[PDB]
Amino acid sequence: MDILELSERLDLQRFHSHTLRLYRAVCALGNNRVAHALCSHVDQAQLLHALEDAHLPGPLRAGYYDLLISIHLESACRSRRSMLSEYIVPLTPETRAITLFPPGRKGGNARRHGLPGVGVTTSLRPPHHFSPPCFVAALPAAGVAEAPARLSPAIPLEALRDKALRMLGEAVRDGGQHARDPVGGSVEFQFVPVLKLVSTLLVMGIFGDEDVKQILKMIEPEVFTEELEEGLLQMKLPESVKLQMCNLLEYFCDQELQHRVESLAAFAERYVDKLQANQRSRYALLMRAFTMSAAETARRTREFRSPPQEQINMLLHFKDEADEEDCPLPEDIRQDLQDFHQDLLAHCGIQLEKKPQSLQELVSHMVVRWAQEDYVQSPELVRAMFSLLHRQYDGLGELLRALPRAYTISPSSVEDTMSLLECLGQIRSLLIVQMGPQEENLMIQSIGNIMNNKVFYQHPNLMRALGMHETVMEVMVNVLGGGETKEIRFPKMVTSCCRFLCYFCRISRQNQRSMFDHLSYLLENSGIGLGMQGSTPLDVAAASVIDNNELALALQEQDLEKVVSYLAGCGLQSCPMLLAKGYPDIGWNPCGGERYLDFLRFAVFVNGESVEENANVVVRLLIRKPECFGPALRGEGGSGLLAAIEEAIRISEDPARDGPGVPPEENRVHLGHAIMSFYAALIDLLGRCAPEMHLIQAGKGEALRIRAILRSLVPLDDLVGIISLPLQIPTLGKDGALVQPKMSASFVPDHKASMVLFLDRVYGIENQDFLLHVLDVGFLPDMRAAASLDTATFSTTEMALALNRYLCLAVLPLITKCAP
Amino acid sequence: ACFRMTPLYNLPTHRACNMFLESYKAAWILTEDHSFEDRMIDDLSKAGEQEEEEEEVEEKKPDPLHQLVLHFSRTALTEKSKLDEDYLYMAYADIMAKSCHLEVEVSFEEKEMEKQRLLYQQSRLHTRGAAEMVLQMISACKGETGAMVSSTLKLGISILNGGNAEVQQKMLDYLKDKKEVGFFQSIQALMQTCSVLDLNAFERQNKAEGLGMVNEDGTVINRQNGEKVMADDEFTQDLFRFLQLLCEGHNNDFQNYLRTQTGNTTTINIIICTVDYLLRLQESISDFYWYYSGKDVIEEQGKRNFSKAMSVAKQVFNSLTEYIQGPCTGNQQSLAHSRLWDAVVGFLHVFAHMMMKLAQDSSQIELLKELLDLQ
Amino acid sequence: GVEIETISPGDGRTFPKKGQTCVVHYTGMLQNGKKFDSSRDRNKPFKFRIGKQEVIKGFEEGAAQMSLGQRAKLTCTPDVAYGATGHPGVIPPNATLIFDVELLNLE
Amino acid sequence: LVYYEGGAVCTHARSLWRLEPLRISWSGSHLRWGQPLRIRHVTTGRYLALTEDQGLVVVDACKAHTKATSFCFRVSKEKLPKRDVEGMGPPEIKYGESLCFVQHVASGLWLTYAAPDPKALRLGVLKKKAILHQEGHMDDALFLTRCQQEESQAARMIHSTAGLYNQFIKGLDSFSGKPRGSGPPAGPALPIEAVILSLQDLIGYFEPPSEELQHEEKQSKLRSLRNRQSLFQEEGMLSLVLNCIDRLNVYTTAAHFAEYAGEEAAESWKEIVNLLYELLASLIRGNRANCALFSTNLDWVVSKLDRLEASSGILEVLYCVLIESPEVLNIIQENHIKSIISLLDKHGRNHKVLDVLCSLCVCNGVAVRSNQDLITENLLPGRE
């Protein structure tokens, strides 16, 4: 039956409208595979005819128009809309030719305002992905989560925009007819779906220059003349149409904003070149200034002995006109900037009649006229109309809030930025979807493309302005929140992205300083970060604090006691997922405890010296909770630390107690190795928390007091016992089979270096008899072992190279200082 | 590196343009001044084309400003766990606020016209429900410091300049006929979250300028990044300035309302709480003297720290004067029974060695004269 | 598993061979009388590179069987079609397909 | 067992105590320090008492012998019943101020927290057992706080309301087995009319506020509605009604209900199951936590879609859960969606089913591609 019958068959009309709503639901939020599937059920011809049918009912007509937008437009529209908030300006000749005003002579201070949305826009906007919907093609043999995601179903937009223009032109003149039979039965049904379609196509930028000119003519003809026929704004529309009208206006306001930004970029391009030439000329003239001058050249050459930021600051330091003498620029060049400051404000309507004659005070007049003419009821309509109203008078504040996201790039890297922006669109698109196995591999390869991109390292400022780092930190927050307690679903993407965060911190300190704010925010998420192996939020925090003395100096105390409460939790109970693998039970977690220990090591030790302020508070809070040191050093019930090390070494060497009794999986847990790794990081922590010698000879109370506490803590007799503890050596025999111990399951020389650094920084060596007494027992067998392994077959071994690093990091500098 | 680096003209053009635009915005556009808020609210507050309809129902449709007021009332009074950020509310509230005050022997003949003009500008707003914006926003902010409570607080001060009695009356009537505790709960939490001086933070700050770390993209000399000691001084000062304004003019029953609320089921004696905060301030100021007493000279950052601390302390004492003036016997009893005396003796002991320390040298004459008006 | 019935024979001489693409205005429809695809609705002739396995078996061999300018009725079993999985959300698994194909042009 | 329990429990009905003085006349007089008076819990009908076996517990209301239950209030711990005042009484004890220590009038023991801390209170939330100590500690001071009239009325609601259906449930499983055949029913006649009247009152008591109401009163009524819904779930009314539907669900039709319950109850079976669904929807509509409580038993409601007695009510219950909790959406599995499709195949073109599917796709603006793929896989290609 004809759908026009449903205008009387109401029950069918409601059911089918709800059906169309379900159609717009299943294909919503970038589900282009379902959108392509739906293209079979509703065809291109079906949609186009439903657009052009003027006898269709209201809800069904609106549903079909919205459905067309959902099938074809929304996936590309959302991503492009998001990219409208950033303004990357390449250095191109058409960018150079971009001027604030079109060529005119009406006003010297300011010409007539250019037509919004008409002209050249050089902002880097990624192209859309349109795949013609082909259904007879063979189904791919590739498995899921590896095949590329479906793109938007293609549809002729060049003809579609012509259809849209014809439709709205007919609707405008029908409004002038004031006919008693509106299309769809109501004014809002006659206008809202059409305006929504024009809004979306405007966002895509399908319209040409003349198409936008026609749109302005049908919006308001007389105001938009360059050198019933009445615009839509005088037809007393309903509120829903007013809402879509606001959506139409805000796009042109955005286009004006982008035009201003590009005008600034063009003037910046010309002015920088002129200033570069002038500064070169001044430098060349100042070279011969030494013949007729003297030591007063200091503040002349301060520019050339000072980096460019304050150079341009003092060069531009002439706005108030009370500081001209400091500025060495010629007055005509300064006049160029002053004139360009004049017209920019005039363009923004600052300073330089029933016809507004321009959009700037046309929309403001429109909004105030609507508000005074009737009581607006729709809340989001009020939100939209007053957001516009705030945007009109304030010509500069929006520019001030748009400049931090503005940036200029070299033309040679536009294609480099293309891939980065496309992957940025992909990860941004994943913020609105529940995390899935299909989405993980596409976003891991996206961040891999970020790693491969040169501009990712070349322009850290642009990276920070784009702010992918915070967006990725939310996507971790959601993925850990899903299964926040039970299990970390999609662990591979978690560790692959925290790897990107660690690299991001290492790109630059400004990126690190920006990341420094979220540490506590990262710290709550690090509570379950012990579950994952590899790159973890704790590692991200360490990379966000390390190699900067300024960082960890403003590190708030509240983080510290929560970290050591986690250490207490590590020490009071067995590790859950480690114990679930059939391992024998021990009442504490060496691996998680080690993680916090090396984290605090990065927290308190920077650039080769200890931070005293962080050092005393960490040792104070750590020593307040002795339960996390391990089986030893607890006092009552606590055996020797050295004895616990022989417990760990022999349990590590003996199977069925070090492992599950079943590396084979490259992440096998070795309990004996982990316990002593924890002990080594515990003592390396205390060693790097040790007070400095200059404060010690300074005699300051707390500085002496802490070290005296550490001496009462750790007896040096156990330490020299650990020094005397042997190392398993690669032996020759059995047809030359080298018995090579594995670092994953053997005592490493770097542990011993941790204890050597501790005794050097805390205990020290004062006398010769005990100096030799510590040298001969443990350093001598190891150095002889290294000398013996210094051969053809044993030098290349990990044990030998680790001994080489250990001796040259901890042993040899210690005895170099103890040489006299 | 400064003696070994390259001049400006060898820098890449795209980098140079980025540096130029960054310098340009701070040096020209932020510094640029433009006043438009007066013709904002004149157009919003005026209603047009109702003359043509000439309707006599008395329906009283809102004027364009009043629609804004109703809309923000609706989003203020809607029930949500968190008061989600609205940048337009930032824009409109700042526009709404600073458009009111707009401010050599001036005489009492012409002195009054600026006052009644300020009253006219406030009357343009409080007659339109703008007075309810501050109460609803403070009730809905739930006691967390933020942009909204700052902008709303500045609006409250703006509409309450000169102690507008009628505005105070509207405040009192709304609190009385709504009888909600969340307002004073928010006020108590917000004031309890106000910061005091920290020695550890101060010393950590002191270590920073010894480094004098600059940025890589050029150089900024001793950058003016956010100070971690007394960052919320403007907010705390504004909060007590607002509390002072809502009791200015000896609004006796309003002061008794602050001390106790019969209508409210739960009563929070904010007067006692205010004393508690002043008490918390006295240890910080005393210990900040107890870091400089040994040192013969006080450095510049410490001088600025004293200035911002005592500006807030002056505002607190001015407020505390306001609650008890009139005299309000209930408040006077609350002050006497509270721990005000401990703060008083601590401040006196601080003031004991202030002027003696500062009088030794001529470099602390400023900080001495502001301290002198503080006592 | 594909069968051809001519509807309006065309050339009968220049059969589609390897090395040249085929341009067709097909019309796919389910065996239950339900249309699911076409090319005239999109107003664009569907062109496929024959011999490179972009389309299903039945359509490929069927399109290779007729000649230039020939309209044919193509019957494809699920064995030469998508079969046990169908086309997700469009064609149910294990269904027989019928195509009205007019091979309008070659290259 | 009585506890010093914190959190929302202090904003819950279980923290309310009603005092009943021993005086028949002028029982609402102002409290003078030290008159004898009983303490009763609002929602359980239990009286605090010094029991013989476990010291301080809340004994049932049928065994309060007025000796172990009565108590008295004094400002201090010193060894301090007067002549009752036939009027307003001297207003002395204040709400939130005028601190008092409560002592057993007959035993002379003062209430105080149990000092030992178990492993439950070692790191977790602190519920502190109260022991009627002989003398007690110093910091056992008790603040006295008002209850709002709606709180008091609601607290009386649970206590009166729960017992009726508890009796109804025990009447239900009394004839769960042992078919009546042609003889008399199992036991006492079930209060069909009283239950139906209570159900109608509860539905009206949980009626959402009307659309025409102004935004201020609409939000205030919404807050009251959420509070009452949360309190009733916190008192377990959701579990009790779940027992009601589950117990009535064993009979397919009224004849099946007749064969065990009786002819007189068979007719009301349809009405009661419709009313139970309506109240259930009114209980859960718009509730974040209560809707989240149905993520555990999603298949429980899914199991009853095939029933013909009440499809609209359970569908509304499903819709209210769906439009509220995305975590419930994460529990959806391929059998459930086919069952939803079976609703369309067995009940005609009901657009509410489409609305259910629409809610199934997206919740809180978050796309669920797994469910969207299942919808297009199991619904679209058939085209039937």
From Swiss-Prot, chain C:
- Description of activity control: Inhibited by both FK506 and rapamycin.
Domain PPIase FKBP-type, by residue range, is: 19-107
A Gene Ontology molecular function term of the record: signaling receptor binding
Recorded GO cellular component terms are: calcium channel complex; cytoplasm; membrane; sarcoplasmic reticulum membrane; Z disc
Location in the cell = Cytoplasm; Sarcoplasmic reticulum
The record's account of tissue expression is: Detected in heart muscle (at protein level). Isoform 1 and isoform 2 are ubiquitous with highest levels in brain and thymus.
SUPFAM superfamilies recorded for this chain? FKBP-like (SSF54534)
Determine the domain of life of the protein's source.
Eukaryota
What InterPro entries does this protein's entry cite? FKBP-type_PPIase, PPIase_dom_sf, PPIase_FKBP_dom
Pfam families, from UniProt? FKBP_C
Which top-level enzyme class is recorded in the Swiss-Prot or TrEMBL entry? isomerase
Entry keyword Cytoplasm: yes
The Enzyme Commission number assigned here is 5.2.1.8
Reactions listed under catalytic activity:
[protein]-peptidylproline (omega=180) = [protein]-peptidylproline (omega=0)
The biological process GO terms on file are: 'de novo' protein folding; calcium-mediated signaling; insulin secretion involved in cellular response to glucose stimulus; negative regulation of calcium-mediated signaling; negative regulation of heart rate; negative regulation of insulin secretion involved in cellular response to glucose stimulus; negative regulation of release of sequestered calcium ion into cytosol; neuronal action potential propagation
Recite the UniProt keywords alphabetically: Cytoplasm, Isomerase, Rotamase, Sarcoplasmic reticulum
PANTHER family attached here? PEPTIDYL-PROLYL CIS-TRANS ISOMERASE, PEPTIDYL-PROLYL CIS-TRANS ISOMERASE FKBP1B
Quaternary structure annotation from Swiss-Prot or TrEMBL: Identified in a complex composed of RYR2, FKBP1B, PKA catalytic subunit, PRKAR2A, AKAP6, and the protein phosphatases PP2A and PP1. Interacts directly with RYR2.
The family classification in the record reads:
Belongs to the FKBP-type PPIase family. FKBP1 subfamily.
- Its function? Has the potential to contribute to the immunosuppressive and toxic effects of FK506 and rapamycin. PPIases accelerate the folding of proteins. It catalyzes the cis-trans isomerization of proline imidic peptide bonds in oligopeptides.
The molecule here is called Peptidyl-prolyl cis-trans isomerase FKBP1B
Please name the source species. Homo sapiens
Swiss-Prot record, chain D:
| Coiled-coil regions listed | none
Q: How is it modified after translation?
A: The N-terminus is blocked.
Give the location in the cell.
Sarcoplasmic reticulum membrane
Domain MIR spans what residues? 28-88, 90-148
Q: Which cysteines are joined by disulfide bonds?
A: none
Mutating residue 369 to C: effect? Decreases threshold for channel activation by K(+), caffeine and 4-chloro-m-cresol. Decreases inhibition by Mg(2+)
* Expression sites (tissue/organ): Detected in skeletal muscle (at protein level). Fast- or slow-twitch skeletal muscle.
About its domains, the entry says:
The calcium release channel activity resides in the C-terminal region while the remaining part of the protein constitutes the 'foot' structure spanning the junctional gap between the sarcoplasmic reticulum (SR) and the T-tubule. Pore opening is mediated via the cytoplasmic calcium-binding domains that mediate a small rotation of the channel-forming transmembrane regions that then leads to channel opening.
The miscellaneous remark of the record is: Binding of [3H]ryanodine indicates that the heterozygous channel is activated by Ca(2+) concentrations 4-fold lower than normal. Single-cell analysis of cotransfected cells shows a significantly increased resting cytoplasmic Ca(2+) level and a significantly reduced luminal Ca(2+) level.
Give the UniProt family note. Answer: Belongs to the ryanodine receptor (TC 1.A.3.1) family. RYR1 subfamily.
Assembly and binders: Homotetramer. Can also form heterotetramers with RYR2. Identified in a complex composed of RYR1, PDE4D, PKA, FKBP1A and protein phosphatase 1 (PP1). Repeated very high-level exercise decreases interaction with PDE4D and protein phosphatase 1 (PP1). Interacts with CALM; CALM with bound calcium inhibits the RYR1 channel activity. Interacts with S100A1. Interacts with FKBP1A; this stabilizes the closed conformation of the channel. Interacts with CACNA1S; interaction with CACNA1S is important for activation of the RYR1 channel. Interacts with CACNB1.
| Biological role stated in the UniProt entry | Cytosolic calcium-activated calcium channel that mediates the release of Ca(2+) from the sarcoplasmic reticulum into the cytosol and thereby plays a key role in triggering muscle contraction following depolarization of T-tubules. Repeated very high-level exercise increases the open probability of the channel and leads to Ca(2+) leaking into the cytoplasm. Can also mediate the release of Ca(2+) from intracellular stores in neurons, and may thereby promote prolonged Ca(2+) signaling in the brain. Required for normal embryonic development of muscle fibers and skeletal muscle.
This chain's protein is named: Ryanodine receptor 1
Q: Which residues of the full protein are shown?
A: 244 to 630 of 5037
